[PDB]
Design brief:
The chain is of the alpha+beta class. It has two domains: 239 residues, no CATH class; 215 residues, no CATH class. The chain contains eleven helices and 18 strands. A seven-stranded mixed sheet has the order 7-12-18-17-15-13-14. The radius of gyration is 22 Å and the shape is globular. It comes from Gentiana triflora (Clustered gentian). Its main location: cytoplasm. It catalyses: an anthocyanidin 3,5-di-O-beta-D-glucoside + (E)-4-coumaroyl-CoA = an anthocyanidin 3-O-beta-D-glucoside 5-O-beta-D-[(6-O-(E)-4-coumaroyl)glucoside] + CoA. It is an enzyme of class 2 (transferase).
Length: 454
């Protein structure tokens, strides 16, 4: 590692313009995600300015803007409170009398910045190295442990660029919500204290009185998770040495059409299939991902799990800007023989759409079968699995602290699993950037089959 830390500090919300306390409940949507304490989000920026300007001006204004935007995102300055004793339930808490506050790390790195941001093969470890390791438990009260929610590590590459590296506990925000926060923080820094986050649709909602647990999912989800939380809680927070490299792929909207029509042409008349930019991009990626395994050296089932934002399907109406987890587990299944065969792309896209219709588009309600979300996931062999985090809906390249849009946005937390992430493309309007992570021998296999599909 060539990352040297310059300063560690604490960012609090504004004093005397906040409540001394804010307690927040743990809805049944948040419970599946309680054991995941890393939802990393890296953002590289071109910054052709002297390290002096960085420290003199850039760090203050970020420290400054972060404080202001915290008065609208208060829970992010608090912690998660995990129960130590049976019969108590988790919660979120911000106590200003505890000096609750996000840890900012001011760092300086001496690596090649144009390398760390590129789309060509990038060592995944170099990327995890730019993130601060949040503690597992910052203090133990008498009912619950206190687990931190957010830390950011700003890191300068002198005369090259800046890398903003955030780390959120997955209990407090899903992909949509966490990107809203990053975009408010950027927005208030760029424009200033008199920045209208409401008008910009970057104003959260923490009211969960309208989140109602009508199917008793909260009780069921807690008890299934009990086993998981014990096992996964004893993982020291340091990033393991990943034997995985990162590569980045870009599809135009037109290259999605070349995939769309490829599916339509493959005589997908028989049953009409739903063909969207999302189901396309996964469909094609999953198909390549399955084939890559073979070229490295069966006829079992391959699974592809993804999340879906229920905020729009809930009842009562749940605000679009509701902050927190609000996701649905979807698991496509398909035959290895079929996904690698002549109709592989067509099989995959059909499979992914057939998973949303039974789950999300379940014409009986989203939560109708939700007592099963937690018990399908575990029935996936780790050997036959693909996952996708993020969504083209989220404005990942709109995070502009005042230096321009980002050079790259990397959901770095993918390496912890057989995952890919799909992000709004930076340079193409309705395109997508697909972040893939694989060992290099494997990764070469992927890209080959990825290139050949056109």
């Amino acid at each position: 590692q060539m990352v040297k830390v310059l300063e560690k500090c604490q960012v609090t919300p504004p004093s005397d313009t906040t409540d001394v306390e804010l307690s927040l409940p743990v809805t049944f949507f948040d419970i599946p995600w309680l054991h995941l304490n890393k939802m990393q989000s890296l953002l590289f920026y071109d910054f052709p300015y002297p390290r002096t300007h960085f420290l003199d001006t850039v760090i203050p204004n970020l420290k400054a803007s972060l404080s202001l935007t915290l008065k609208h995102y208060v829970p992010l300055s608090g912690n998660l409170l995990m129960p130590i004793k049976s019969g108590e339930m988790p919660k979120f808490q911000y106590s200003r009398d505890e000096g609750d506050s996000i840890t900012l790390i001011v760092a300086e790195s001496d690596q090649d910045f144009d390398y760390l941001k590129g789309h060509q093969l990038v060592d995944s470890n170099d990327l995890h190295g730019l993130f601060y390791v949040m503690p597992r438990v910052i203090r133990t009260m008498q009912d619950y442990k206190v687990i931190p929610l957010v830390a950011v590590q700003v890191t300068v590459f002198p005369n090259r660029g800046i890398a903003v590296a955030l780390t959120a506990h997955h209990s407090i925000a899903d992909a949509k919500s966490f990107v809203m926060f990053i975009n408010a923080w950027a927005y208030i820094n760029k424009f200033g204290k008199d920045a209208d986050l409401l008008s910009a649709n970057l104003l959260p909602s923490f009211d969960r009185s309208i989140i109602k647990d009508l199917y008793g999912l909260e009780e069921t989800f807690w008890n299934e998770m009990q086993d998981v939380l014990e096992m996964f809680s004893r993982f020291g927070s340091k990033p393991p040495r990943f034997n995985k490299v990162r590569a980045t792929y870009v599809l135009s909207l037109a290259e999605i059409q070349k995939l769309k029509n490829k599916v339509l042409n493959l005589r997908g008349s028989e049953p009409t299939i739903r063909v969207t930019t999302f189901t396309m991009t996964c469909g094609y990626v999953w198909t390549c991902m399955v084939k890559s395994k073979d070229d490295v050296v069966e006829n079992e089932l391959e699974y592809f799990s993804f999340t879906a934002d229920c905020r729009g399907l809930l009842t009562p109406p749940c605000p679009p800007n509701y902050f927190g987890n609000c996701l649905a587990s979807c698991v496509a299944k398909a035959t290895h023989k079929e996904l690698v065969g002549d109709k592989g792309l067509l099989v995959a896209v059909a499979a992914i759409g057939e998973a949303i219709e039974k789950r999300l588009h379940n014409e009986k309600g989203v939560l109708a079968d939700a007592k099963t979300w937690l018990s399908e996931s575990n029935g996936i062999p780790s050997k036959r699995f693909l996952g996708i985090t993020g969504s083209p809906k989220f404005d990942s390249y709109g995070v502009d602290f005042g230096w321009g849009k980002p050079a790259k946005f990397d959901i770095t937390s993918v390496d912890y699993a057989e995952l890919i992430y799909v992000i709004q493309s930076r340079d193409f309007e309705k395109g997508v950037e697909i972040g893939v992570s694989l060992p290099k021998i494997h990764m070469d296999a992927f890209a080959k089959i990825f290139e050949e599909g056109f």
